[model samples]
Target chain A: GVTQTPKFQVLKTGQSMTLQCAQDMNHEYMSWYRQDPGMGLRLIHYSVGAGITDQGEVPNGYNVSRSTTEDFPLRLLSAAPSQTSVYFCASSYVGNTGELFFGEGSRLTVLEDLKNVFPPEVAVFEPSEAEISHTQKATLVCLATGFYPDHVELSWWVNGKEVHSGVCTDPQPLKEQPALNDSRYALSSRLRVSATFWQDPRNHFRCQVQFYGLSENDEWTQDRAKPVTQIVSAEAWGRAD
Target chain B: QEVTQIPAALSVPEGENLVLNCSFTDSAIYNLQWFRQDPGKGLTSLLLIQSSQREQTSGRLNASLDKSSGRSTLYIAASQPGDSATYLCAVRPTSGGSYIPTFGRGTSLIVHPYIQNPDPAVYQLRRSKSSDKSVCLFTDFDSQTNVSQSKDSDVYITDKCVLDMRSMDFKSNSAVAWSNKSDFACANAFNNSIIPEDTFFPS
Candidate 1:
């Protein structure tokens, strides 16, 4: 469930913004949920008609009110870096067990002071054994792990030429040590290539991953890691029959 | 600490009666919810009844809630094979201005295919939500709450109730009395004293 022109937006420190929401189905109950980088969907606040509202798990920064049967608006008095996340505006007839409907998502970001504590380590290791046959294909595994904030874009290149096809990634990064830390995330991206593509001696394959995070000291201009090359074995050059 | 759903697991033939019960230790709850989830699919919402309301109904599914007892029941008449799933119940606490729900271990149900109907459906129709019945007696509240309405509404009174309508100088005192161990109290806002539970007949 989603609408509105300003789907994606950014806010400054201490800035206030009202997360607009409207449902015309005459629903008596409306709710708001916030999703973070690695944090699963969390309940923020909900309302039952006008003048009756309540809090959920994450209710520090935002507040909500159901002014009418169809509209519920959430507002943040002082936006902070931790408040940057996607929001879902949901509505139900009676609450809970009723059929809940959500509309267009609203993603918000707080910039200008946003700190990125942990950056991911990207590595492209040795490719699978080069079984260059009529039906054999080659695969390369690129891993980016130990990242604090999500949103990593990994690209594959062959002989300094970028390729966009035959690449797959995890739907969402796998979280690690959530009992102690809930921010660290890890994901693997695989690249599939034709047998002939890896058999050539002239080919050089590498992986470059980029991130949209800022360091605590704002070190990197692009906040990206250098490309990692994959090692080719002797058997990869038609040595194995 | 958590809501309790009875009959952890059950199996019945098609066209049979199914009853699921859930109860909370505390009576201060905003709502009670019942849901069904298939083996591999997301949860399908069945019904949500508020503490203010008594009963609600959906397609062949009826729910009854007793806020005074902090209990709720779900009834499925002539259940079919498709009704076989995990039935879940959750309660939303009414304190701290919060509505986050706490769930109970689901009651797994298995409805067999076309088998001979054992006994006739046992599910009966409960009173409607709009019935002129008063569930929120003065006993429902721990402290004395100011009465604002005089007509026989949600608010009710116990024996020896008085009404002081100084605005119109109309003092009403003709309300019946009840002598049950379950005592309650309420008074008139502008009209007459709250009708006694045992003496006043509600149609």
Candidate 2:
């Protein structure tokens, strides 16, 4: 059965929240946490907006204040980088699953850095599953890991031939700084192809993450490492049939 | 772990079965997930098949996983137009990055609505002749009716049509008839006019 979702919205562009939460039903004692891609979901409130004067921390520049019995205003005052975000939620545990679940949502990354560019580590694996696409399409996703300044170019290659069709890299490289000096980032791009495309035993694909922060000959043109590549041979595909 | 959701988009007729698949590259999964996203709405968690629980159900939605195969499925039974939405699948990893879930490109579903009552099939059921029996014509232009079947024969009747034909003789040429007992029943009728068994022929 479909459970009506308790909407946890990022609201308007300024990062304010018009979040709607419940229990199908509710009993007050609610709390929230936001987890960035590759990060942990830490609780934002043990600061349960109980009083108007005791507003919680304005995480990522958003002041957390009680709006109504149902809503607590979390207004955003700034923006850093865009990241894939997952907002975890919980409410009164009575007569419920008593478990914590998160909704997939987006929030701006709140970290800023001026130095120490960390290049990503990349490795690709063969397609891990198969699908029956009677009226469906297939895809391939490439990921680039913890890097700085949110800059990277993703390219697809089928056996060394660069592919242009069915490729759209995520516009924003997600940012997550779990600690003071932590700036772990990630990006996603997918290559749309057919399920039959992977059925062939000879096809080889690579996801190339080209770094663009600094360049070679730092005094002349600046220097950057060779683009990291992730490859998966179709030959290794575990065809179920 | 990297997760892949397939068939970026999908369309299925209302009341049809639907499946959204997900695959993950790494095996260290604590659970597999599914979520539903209606247009303009934030995604709601659909289900999470824990590593130990391979298959589970809720209402019409079911989630299953094959860890040995590293793939999972969300099955929607008897889908409805309201069920149209994007379905996201993911692998909830157990690494230090356990807080994060790796998602696949979600599968979008468009469940086409169905036409329930299509204009009572027009007067294609007009009165006529039949086996050892005859039908008298009548109509019910104001109300709706349909052909109903019985073990003995097909009977098309109206609120006013007397189904009690025990008084009529099926073994004779006398016709079994129905009169306009109700104003609206002028639209309902029986082909009980006795044309005489042999006279029903062209000759």
Per-residue lDDT of candidate 1, residues A200-219 (tens digit): 66677767666544324333
**Model 2 alpha-carbon drift over 4 Å, by segment:** A1-75, A79-241, B116-203
Residue A117 in model 1: shift from native, Å?
7.2
For each candidate, the DockQ is: 0.01, 0.03
Task: Give one digit per residue, the lDDT tens place, for model 2 in B1-203.
Answer: 66778777887666888888888888777677687765433557778677777897889999889987888988899997558777877665454442334567688786654433211111111111111212222211111222231122223222111111122210101111222223323223333321212221110
Q: Write the per-residue lDDT of candidate 1 for residues B54-84, one digit (tens) a residue.
A: 8989988999999788789999999975587
**CA lDDT of every candidate:** 0.55, 0.45
Q: What is the TM-score, restricted to chain A, for candidate 1?
A: 0.51
- Candidate 2 lDDT for residue B16: 87
Kept native contacts, fraction for each prediction = 0.01, 0.07
Clashing pairs in 1: A1-A102, A1-A103, A1-A104, A2-A103, A2-A104, B157-B186, B158-B184, B158-B185
| Model 1 misplaced regions, further than 4 Å | A2-13, A34-43, A50-60, A68-70, A80-88, A95-97, A102-126, A131-135, A143-148, A152-186, A192-241, B1-203
TM-scores of the models, in the order given: 0.40, 0.35
